[PDB]
Amino acid sequence: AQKIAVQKDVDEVVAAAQRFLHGSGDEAKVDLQKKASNLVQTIRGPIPAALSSMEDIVKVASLRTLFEAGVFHAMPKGGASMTASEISAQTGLDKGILIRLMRAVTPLGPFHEVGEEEYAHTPFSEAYLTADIAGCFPVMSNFIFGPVLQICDFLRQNNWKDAITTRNNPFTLAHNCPGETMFEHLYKNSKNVAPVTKAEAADVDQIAMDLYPWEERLSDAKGSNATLVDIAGSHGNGTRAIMALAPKLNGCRFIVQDLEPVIGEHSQALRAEGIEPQVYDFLKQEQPVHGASIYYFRRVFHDWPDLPEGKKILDNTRAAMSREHSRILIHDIIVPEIGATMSHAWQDLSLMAIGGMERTEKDFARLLDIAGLALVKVWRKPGDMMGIIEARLK
Amino acid sequence: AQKIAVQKDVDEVVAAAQRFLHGSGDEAKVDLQKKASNLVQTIRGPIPAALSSMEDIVKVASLRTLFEAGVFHAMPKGGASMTASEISAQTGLDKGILIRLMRAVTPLGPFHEVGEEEYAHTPFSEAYLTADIAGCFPVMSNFIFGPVLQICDFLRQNNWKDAITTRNNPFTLAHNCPGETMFEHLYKNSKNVAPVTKAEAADVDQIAMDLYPWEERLSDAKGSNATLVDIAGSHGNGTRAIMALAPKLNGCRFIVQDLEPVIGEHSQALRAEGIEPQVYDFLKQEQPVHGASIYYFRRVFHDWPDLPEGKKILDNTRAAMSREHSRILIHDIIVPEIGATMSHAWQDLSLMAIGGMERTEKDFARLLDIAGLALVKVWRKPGDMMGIIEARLK
Ligand SMILES: C=CC(C)(C)[C@@]12C=C(O)C(=O)N3/C(=C/c4c[nH]cn4)C(=O)N[C@]31N(OC)c1ccccc12
Ligand SMILES: C=CC(C)(C)[C@@]12C=C(O)C(=O)N3/C(=C/c4c[nH]cn4)C(=O)N[C@]31N(OC)c1ccccc12
Ligand SMILES: Nc1ncnc2c1ncn2[C@@H]1O[C@H](C[C@@H](N)CC[C@H](N)C(=O)O)[C@@H](O)[C@H]1O
Ligand SMILES: Nc1ncnc2c1ncn2[C@@H]1O[C@H](C[C@@H](N)CC[C@H](N)C(=O)O)[C@@H](O)[C@H]1O
Secondary structure (H helix, E strand, O other): OOOHHHHHHHHHHHHHHHHHOOOOOOHHHHHHHHHHHHHHHHHHOHHHHHOHHHHHHHHHHHHHHHHHOOHHHHOOHHHOEEEHHHHHHHHOOOHHHHHHHHOOOOOOOOEEEEEOOEEEEOHHHHHHHOHHHHHHHHHHHHHHHHHHHHHHHHHHHOOOOOOOEOOEOHHHHHOOOOOOOHHHHHHHOHHHHHHHHHHHHOOOOOOOOOOOOHHHHHOOOOOOOOEEEEEOOOOOHHHHHHHHHOOOOOOOEEEEEEOHHHHHHHHHHHHHOOOEEEEOOOOOOOOOOOOOOEEEEEOOHHHOOHHHHHHHHHHHHHOOOOOOOOOEEEEEEEEOOOOOOHHHHHHHHHHHOOOOOOEEHHHHHHHHHHOOEEEEEEEOOOOOOEEEEEEEEO | OOOHHHHHHHHHHHHHHHHHOOOOOOHHHHHHHHHHHHHHHHHHOHHHHHOHHHHHHHHHHHHHHHHHOOHHHHOOHHHOEEEHHHHHHHHOOOHHHHHHHHOOOOOOOOEEEEEOOEEEEOHHHHHHHOHHHHHHHHHHHHHHHHHHHHHHHHHHHOOOOOOOEOOEOHHHHHOOOOOOOHHHHHHHOHHHHHHHHHHHHOOOOOOOOOOOOHHHHHOOOOOOOOEEEEEOOOOOHHHHHHHHHOOOOOOOEEEEEEOHHHHHHHHHHHHHOOOEEEEOOOOOOOOOOOOOOEEEEEOOHHHOOHHHHHHHHHHHHHOOOOOOOOOEEEEEEEEOOOOOOHHHHHHHHHHHOOOOOOEEHHHHHHHHHHOOEEEEEEEOOOOOOEEEEEEEEO
16 A cells, blocks of 8 residues: 555655754744644545544534533543533533533543543643633634634635625624625624633733833933833733833823723723723724834734724824834734744634734835825844834824 | 654654555554644644634635636646636736735645746646636635535524524525525525536545445346436446446336436436436425335435434335335445544534434434334445445335
8 A cells, every 4th residue: 555655754754753852942843743633644644634624613613612501611631530410410501512512622632531421521621711712712713713614614605705894704604794804794783792802811932022212212201202012012011011021110100091991891900000080992993002112012903904994003003103203113014925834823813803914014115105194114033923013203 | 952852753653654655455543643643733833723714714615716716727737837828818817916915825735836927837727727726616605615614603693503404504594595405505596507517427436336245136126126226326336336336137117316407417318328307306306206126215314314304214115115125325424433534524514404314323323213214234345435224124
């Protein structure tokens, strides 16, 4: 047979493993994870591997059900087992459904099938209980997955032309709410604000904030100029990072603006840590606080297309700047023009469903020129997916 | 670090590989594919691996869009490349959308990113163009995936109780058609009949038909008794298999019954190969042809719950039998009670969305007793997922 295929792929895994296990602080790790995948695919063969999409779908379905139904929380941590019966008992999910669902997440899924109707946690299932995953994953599976699946349906309505807008997209199609942006439609139900703000807090790859010199720029600023605004700062974790990074400071104003339901959830937590909670909308208003150090956008612009909303953000902010004292900092993923990762692809293509997108370097170039903005410098410590786009008035 | 984790998992892959590469005609292969997956998961780590559900989702989305938009067919086979521009040109899918979508299916996806806006087929993407995958995959992604994703939503409506029925399920919820069974709602639009009949024809794991002695049983039958009926035979590929298996025959009637839109698509193809195309409905009618060799159900019962429809099938067929001359053959997956595969899980849990299910041996036991039917013998050549349930009147 073509068992030969397996050998070559095993060899490469073995090879790539050896490399990974004697480098330092990267390409090695990614390459090995890639050669590891090739093996699985090669073992299965092209035709059986095409069935992976169906397998993948039920697994995401069943994981989502199980997590919502309280199964992850009812099951004992540390790998102690529990029965179908005892689980169903504590959650009220149909023991027959639960048994069937479990089959999707034991054979390889993050659970362990100890024995007949007997299941256990592993660290991979327990990872779904951590702040990052537990804040992120439910929101995505309740509100985003179904839309991403309907991308095909939306573009088919336009004979594969790009009709996507912020208010007419696979999200509005799937949740039947044409005209509303994703945020608008979620915040209308107030029960959603807390989960969504937690999801907005999720930072799985640990964003690097020592990427650009805060201490230097902010404390070379005299008086009213010395003040940073985290626009759409949400929680404010970005601000707190910055503040931690430079305490080499005087009395410096630190403001976190965002919509009202967001400002509610985090306000007095922010007053506490010493930050001004300001309610602001960069779509219906011009930027209030004038002539500041820098106006800082973190994981904001990828929510938006270049026009209309993209230009209006930067235009409503040009209003309150200073030709040479203020500066603008966009902090977001910079997609390579070749060799994108699945980390790149899943964030970008999810946004696609709500009319957002992740931007190339040349994509950020277009955005700046459109708003008559001059690129000062792009900060990136490569081996790191996010850079900062620094810019000024032309 | 815990680079140790990678080593142990590499070792096991290497080990399981060596075993697989000196067995014969199985557990070896599955175990290696399992240890291969562990490695990928271990390399990524529990928290980053939880993000695999999001990655998996966009990949299925983007594959579905690309295949529908005609990209798989526009691209040259054999690994010759083609540009974003030349592809968009031949399909009219937005070159900007196409570029973004491609990122989900190059890094590991079945395509190869030759260079900037330059992509190529590999045998893994070309596999999507084969009869099995190309008949199966579109139907699933258009009609089934979205429902499977909404399993959680449906059961949440019932506080995780099992409300699922053949006409009230995640399918009726997602496609908004409460009251219709999956088949009813698809056949209402006649453009769907041809794709769905091709999907029904899909047989990816190559079902074993030499599993039970046709030559022996059929040709020990005198006269009007000697006649087999493939109920819901669709295409009739099952019948043709059987006929090929025994030509050691006299003039033996071979009938393939199914609903009308199915009988249309395949009728004169079946008359041709010498088979009686009969229109029949085992929900609204009793079984016409009386006292036959055997009544044969292939990949039928997993479309149905035990009651109502399950019992009514066997009851409408008991009508036309012979206490000791006729026999009933259910041919379907037999789920193990432990160590289910993802192959088991994806078929069962998809059905779950339309109120169907795959059955245990003890599950088939319940079904038989409920219809007052006696188990003669279960045929299985293990290492093979499907058996036959042979049964008679009690
Ligand atoms: C789900 C709601 C939001 C959290 C608001 C989110 C919006 C953001 O602006 C954002 O930063 N996000 C995430 C960051 C992250 C990075 N590592 C772990 N989490 C994230 O998962 N989901 C989102 N995201 O991004 C891919 C979305 C995609 C489609 C709709 C909405 C969003
Ligand atoms: C999609 C429509 C059907 C083909 C009618 C199908 C019904 C069957 O009875 C069947 O046998 N099927 C398949 C067999 C197969 C085995 N290996 C490759 N294909 C299959 O994919 N899809 C289905 N299937 O089963 C998991 C479904 C699941 C949910 C709804 C409908 C179905
Ligand atoms: N019209 C709007 N005006 C101002 N902020 C908005 C608007 N729409 C959405 N947002 C906020 O943009 C933020 C997007 C967040 N994902 C980013 C928050 C934060 N900068 C972070 O990096 O995590 C949310 O907090 C939104 O509430
Ligand atoms: N009420 C019904 N009565 C008779 N056949 C039905 C009914 N509903 C669905 N079917 C058929 O059941 C079959 C299910 C197929 N997946 C199986 C066909 C074939 N036995 C095979 O193994 O591939 C389809 O051909 C349906 O048209």
